TrEMBL record, chains A, D:
Top-level division of the source organism's lineage: Viruses
Native source species: Human herpesvirus 1 (HHV-1)
Name the UniProt record assigns to this protein: RL2
Automatic annotation (TrEMBL), chains B, C:
Span covered, complete protein: 640 to 763 of 776
Upper classification of the organism: Viruses, Duplodnaviria, Heunggongvirae, Peploviricota, Herviviricetes
Originating organism: Human herpesvirus 1
The protein's name in its UniProt record: RL2
Amino acid sequence: LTRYLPISGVSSVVALSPYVNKTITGDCLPILDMETGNIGAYVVLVDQTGNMATRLRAAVPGWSRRTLLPETAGNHVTPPEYNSLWMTPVGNMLFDQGTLVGALDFRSLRSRHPWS
Amino acid sequence: LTRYLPISGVSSVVALSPYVNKTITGDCLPILDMETGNIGAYVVLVDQTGNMATRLRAAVPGWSRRTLLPETAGNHVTPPLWMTPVGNMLFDQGTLVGALDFRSLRSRHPWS
Amino acid sequence: LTRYLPISGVSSVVALSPYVNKTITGDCLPILDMETGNIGAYVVLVDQTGNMATRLRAAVPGWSRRTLLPETAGNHVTPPLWMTPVGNMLFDQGTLVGALDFRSLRSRHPWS
Amino acid sequence: LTRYLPISGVSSVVALSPYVNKTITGDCLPILDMETGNIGAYVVLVDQTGNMATRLRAAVPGWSRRTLLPETAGNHVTPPEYNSLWMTPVGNMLFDQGTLVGALDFRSLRSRHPWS
């Protein structure tokens, strides 16, 4: 049972399935705590396709010129084969206390990542 | 003029202010697009205190055993309660837009 | 093909399926646009059980004394756990889109 | 201290400031509980301008032809005169546990409503 946090302004979620102690290279967006300004996390873009990249191109016209990222890196999760609530990359979903949980554990899907 | 994407469930926002071609180590969470299995970006936790870390212990109690992240890193942004860490911000068009450019604030980062 | 807008903090969605020129009585919450003080729409609670009512007692403990709403009204939609009340739904483009047209489901409403 | 629920797909919030036992006429959108199908609330549009109306025009091309609502009804709250987090219709804001709270009580702003 995985939980997912929607991100405002983009049609994306943060999948609450951690991969511990990994190293990534990419283009970073700080995540700020509104109560402190402590930065405990970064969004790391690893390719130039996707919703984050689109939103960032609109938000930052200069980024597409300055970056060194591929159009595509081939990092992915394989969507499941299909009455329910479907999210394409992970399958079955339900609302719990307004929160979002999926039937499966994401780490158990077929997925390639930078560290793979 | 910077844009900010709030993350649901936590009191944190993504600053759409890129620092290009950097490398960080931490605990990674994929960002999924609702329409594809393509993954172009990941959240990387670098503290154990940020709101992302807290919301993850809530969602994932076992994560707190397997992680090797510090309680804290001195990653932070300093502004120049009802006060923003970046100064003035406005709700516009589903997101947050700030008065300033984020790069013009004093901020310590993993590569700083 | 109906669209659904999830409401944050509650397990409820707005069905973008209008029933025109109806009148209801209940407890009203303005819907604010982030860019103006114009109010074109209100949420009207008609039960005391729906998720909206619950989230409001949480936010507004005094509301539960002042309200005169029933515990329940037989307002409901019937489908034809991991099962949607309207059948198949998909996350697309920030919202939810369903297989069916909502008007084609069996639904009881205040004017029903 | 008022709390506000963002609505997905639109740049709007539900203001958690109840006006008890009022009667409205307008065009209704059911709000469904995902766990039951109980309908405990309706969105009631009272004019044809606003974010809900725009989203509904896109979602329902036939609605603009079938409705009997005004372009405008003049229901409103008066925005406050201006380092903080600003939401134009209600002023100062802060994030609390990811939730959204304003400094003021909405019922204490200058606002006209159908029942006024």
